[PDB]
Amino acid sequence: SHMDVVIASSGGGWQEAQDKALWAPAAKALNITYTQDTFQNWAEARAQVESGSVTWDIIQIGIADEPQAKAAGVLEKLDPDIVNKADFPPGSVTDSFVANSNYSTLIAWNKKTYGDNGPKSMADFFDVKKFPGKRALWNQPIGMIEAAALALGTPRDKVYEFLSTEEGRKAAIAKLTELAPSVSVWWESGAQAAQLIKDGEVDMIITWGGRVQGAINDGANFAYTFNDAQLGTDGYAIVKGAPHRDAAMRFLKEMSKAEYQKDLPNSFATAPANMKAYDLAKYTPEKMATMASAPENVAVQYSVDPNFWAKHAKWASEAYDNVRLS
Ligand SMILES: O=C(O)CC[C@H](NCC(=O)[C@@H](O)[C@H](O)[C@H](O)CO)C(=O)O
C-alpha cells in the first residue's frame, strides 16, 4: 500500500505493544513510513500470494505456522545476516522467520465461578464434572489438539510422541468432541478472548498469557496458571512477492535489535526473543514472573513442535473444524 511498508499482526494489546516498542521507533531510526494491518490466520497471506495481488510486506506469525507457510510458497527467504542467531533461542530464527517474542497458550479461569480452586491442569480444564461451566477455546488447532492430549493424561514431555500415531491423534480429537458441548465460544482473536475474560462471559478459557494478564490489569476477576501451558514463539516473515521487499528486510533487521526488544514488555505481558534485551532492560523479578520463557514458568510447560504441524496441520485443521461445528 502506497510507498509504505505494510506490517500485519493480530490486533489488540499485542499489536499496540509491537507498534510502540518496535515499529514506530525502528521506522523513525530508518526514516521510513509504514502502514499497519490486522489478520488472524497465515492462510490470508496465502490467499494474497495465490491471487497475485500482494499488499502485505511483513506478517507476524507463529513458529509452528512457518513450516506450513514456507512449504506453500508464502514466505520470502530472508537475507542471511538479518539477525545474529546466537542472540535468539535455538530454532527461533530460520531462513524465513525471525522471532520477536515467547508467549504461553495457557488456562485462565473465572474467580467468580471457582474462586482460587480453578482448573490447574488440562485434565481439570476437560473435567466438566469437577468444574462445571462454560469453556472457550481458539477456533484454530495449535495448542488445542495438544491440550486434549494432555487432558488424556499424556506427560508434558510426550505430547508429540503420543500425537505421532493415528490412534493418539484420533483420541485427542475424541477428547475435544467430548468437551465440545461445554464450549460456549470458539474465540477468534486475542482481543475477543480478553473481552470474554473482562466481561466474565466464560468460566474458563485456553488463550495467550499476555491477553489474560491485560484483561486482569483491566479489572477482570480471573486467575491463570502456566501449568500444562504451551510455550510458543511469535515472529516475523516477509510475504513472497512483497511490494516493498528490500525496505521490509531493512525494517525487520532494525526492529529485531535489542534496543527495541527491551521495550516490548513495557505495557504488554510478553517475553522478548532477543536474549540481549534482558541485559539492557534489567527486568524486576515481578516483571520476570509474568514471562512465558522465565525459568520458573518454563519448568511447568512444554514447547510447541513446528515439525508436528509441518506434517499434520491439514488433518488437524479439518478434524478441529468438524469439532467446532457442533
Ligand atoms: O507473542 C506474544 O506475546 C503474543 C501472543 C499471541 N500471538 C499468537 C499469534 O501468533 C497471533 O498473533 C496470530 O494468530 C498470528 O499473528 C496470525 O498469524 C497474541 O496475539 O496474544
Cα 52 to ligand 1 centre (Å) = 26
- Entry resolution in angstroms? 1.9
SS3 299: coil
Cα 164 to ligand 1 centre (Å) = 25
Residue in this structure with the C-alpha cell 458441548, named with its chain if needed: 181
Residue with CA closest to ligand 1 atom 12: 10
Q: What are phi and psi of 141, to 5 degrees?
A: -85, -15
Nearest to 199 by CA among 114, 104, 110, 116: 110
Q: Which amino acid is at 262?
A: K
| Ligand 1 binding site (Cβ under 6 Å of any ligand atom) | 9-10, 14, 39-42, 60-62, 65, 101, 103, 190, 208, 210-211, 234, 270
Cα 61 to ligand 1 centre (Å) = 7
Nearest atom in ligand 1 to the alpha carbon of residue 100 is 1
Cα 28 to ligand 1 centre (Å) = 24
Nearest atom in ligand 1 to the alpha carbon of residue 60 is 16
Nearest atom in ligand 1 to the alpha carbon of residue 40 is 17
Q: Which residues of 181-192 are buried (b: 16+ CB within 10 A; e: fewer)?
A: eebebbbebbbb
Q: Is 210 annotated as a binding residue?
A: yes
Cα 41 to ligand 1 centre (Å) = 10
Q: Which residues of 77-111 are buried (b: 16+ CB within 10 A; e: fewer)?
A: ebeeebbeeebbbeebbbebbbbbbbbbbbbbbbb
As given in the structure block, the three cell numbers for residue 107 are 488456562
Contact 147, 99 (CB under 8 A): no
Q: Is 40 annotated as a binding residue?
A: yes
Contact 106, 150 (CB under 8 A): no
Q: Which residues of 169-178 are buried (b: 16+ CB within 10 A; e: fewer)?
A: bebbbebbee
What are the angstrom distances between the C-alpha of 299 and each of 229, 260, 265, 296?
Answer: 10, 28, 21, 6
